[PDB]
Amino acid sequence: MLKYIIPTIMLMPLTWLSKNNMIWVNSTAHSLLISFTSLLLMNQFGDNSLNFSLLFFSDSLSTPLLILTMWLLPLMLMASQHHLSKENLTRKKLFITMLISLQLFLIMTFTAMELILFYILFEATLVPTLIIITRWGNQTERLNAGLYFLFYTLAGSLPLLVALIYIQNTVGSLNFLMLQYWVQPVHNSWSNVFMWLACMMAFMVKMPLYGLHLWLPKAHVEAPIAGSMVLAAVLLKLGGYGMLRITLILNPMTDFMAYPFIMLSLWGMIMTSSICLRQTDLKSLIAYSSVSHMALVIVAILIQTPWSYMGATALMIAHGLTSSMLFCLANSNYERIHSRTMILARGLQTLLPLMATWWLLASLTNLALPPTINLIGELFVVMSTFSWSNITIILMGVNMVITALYSLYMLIMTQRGKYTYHINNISPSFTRENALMSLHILPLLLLTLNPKIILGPLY
Amino acid sequence: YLTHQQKVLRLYKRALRHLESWCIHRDKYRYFACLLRARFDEHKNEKDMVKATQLLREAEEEFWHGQHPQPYIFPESPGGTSYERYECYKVPEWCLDDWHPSEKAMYPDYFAKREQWKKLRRESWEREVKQLQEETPVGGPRTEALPPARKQGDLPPLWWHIVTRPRERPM
Amino acid sequence: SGYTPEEKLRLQQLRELRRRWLKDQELSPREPVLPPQRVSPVERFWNKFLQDGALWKNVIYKTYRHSIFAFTHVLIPVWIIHYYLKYHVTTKPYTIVEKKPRIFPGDTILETGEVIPPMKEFPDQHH
């Protein structure tokens, strides 16, 4: 993975040693070259993972997440240009340095072969993420959002640190390949009930699990656009990727320990989908939408069926591009009206015909219109949960109805009706904004042709 | 606040419209339309503010019991199947200021003839503001009605959006 | 109930401005000023060729445009589809499955010449 780690690090010298007026051009161009080379990670074999060295490996689960991570960095640089156009040159480069250092940690996190190395890099993404929110956030609440984002993750992570080190002493190694062969079943005892919770609650809070999500409406709303894209597209998937790994060493205790979290997830997604029907803030509505889609992933990982693990991988990648696109669309409006209220600017389809086309495609994939990979992942999880229990079809179906209601409600309030009379500065959509939306939706709709590359190791 | 005459007249208009919906056929409506007029002409002179009020309240309660469940509506009236239909073609005037110069070049006469209104609007603005702030009482305006221009060469205050509002069949 | 003395003046003042605004919305004869455009040599031919009614020669343009449509929208696609089906789809097993033809008593099989024996004599009745 040194062929991606080293180039990413070289983006820091490139930014600091480039001309004053070329920091965006040079960082965007070279971060796109890095994304192009990540396609070499698709050399996946049907029996064995692609094991590079003692430190790093890449199977069919890490590869789609790695390509998504390296693809977002240039998109994050396009989004941030407007609101950083009038900031001190050194601080513009510090902002970019934070994004690069965040990509550096992520790709090493998704490829670490040893769980303690995974934990360090999993836990290292907090520092650059917190700095982005609190320093370059726009509101006063950004300071309270960082603390919520910080102590929710750490409150769950620190127990995970104890559990991981405990497992190494007992097993003798945290290397994932070793655990695949030396794993022993987990006896049903009170001691193992709290081993299981320690290994999972760290990853639950990042998904997030309903109940432990109050940090997400704060961190995804008070952060800049570049922060909101990585937060919702990738950083929520560190929880999903973690559970997809650590549940190997938690059987058969997951059979009964998953009940409280399945109920919180099955019922939680109805609750959070309903919240989206009455949200007065457009960005906050998108944040609450993430909790509902990530509730399907938690259920998908906790039932442990091949159809559920294929759905979870597709759902994470699918929601990664859709959630990022929605934040960008909501941000294009904000850069004109400078307010997050949903009911302030209306009928925008009359003034921005092409940007409303992106709104339609963003909403259609959000409500899982087939044959989009959004529907493929959600469909696979529904089939897997039906076999788990036929009654779950009621909750899954109800969420599909509510999901389509708030998705189109967001599309009808801002893109239809009558334009707000007193808003007279809705300038035509820039090429930067239009290209930002294409780079989301176009790769999202292409994966439908060959979806096997986002279906994970169990394909 | 509505006067007794205003409320009485409205009830007469609604009753005929609902009665018109009930009858459909014109001649049948004509027969019953006059009889309804007769019932109104027999209380025109009533000068009792109390007995007259009782008639209106009883008149309304009779209208509700006999109102058509599905009254006829003119297509572009609120509730008819054309209301707000063409609102999706009504673009605000300020959008033209964002057009590319190569796109304004397609209509040199319209945009040359448009600067005049913008020139006219700016010049009149100061007078329109001054006219309002001198005719406004100390405590502020008490109604939404606006004064006209009291000179020659001065446009009525607050005319820009009323005059420039989008047409009714723009596209 | 009618307009107050000032209201009739304001509406007249605006109604004159409003009716003047709607006149400015008209387009001059030259407008829209279309930038210079070049057509293909084929397009120029039909611009002047079809001016005369000549019902006998007018159908030629109808058949010309429909002849082109059938070639570019029916013949080319069926060539691509037939080539695709014959040499790429039908070369894989069970890609195209046909419901076997029905054999009636009295038919002749084209693969072996077998003749299926007819059915026995019926209790014929004319009704």
């Binding site: - | 673009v91 319209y110 | 008209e26």
Partner: peptide, 12 residues
Amino acid sequence: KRLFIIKPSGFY
């Protein structure tokens, strides 16, 4: 009669 139709900018 040909009337000018006001549209949002379509150049971009």
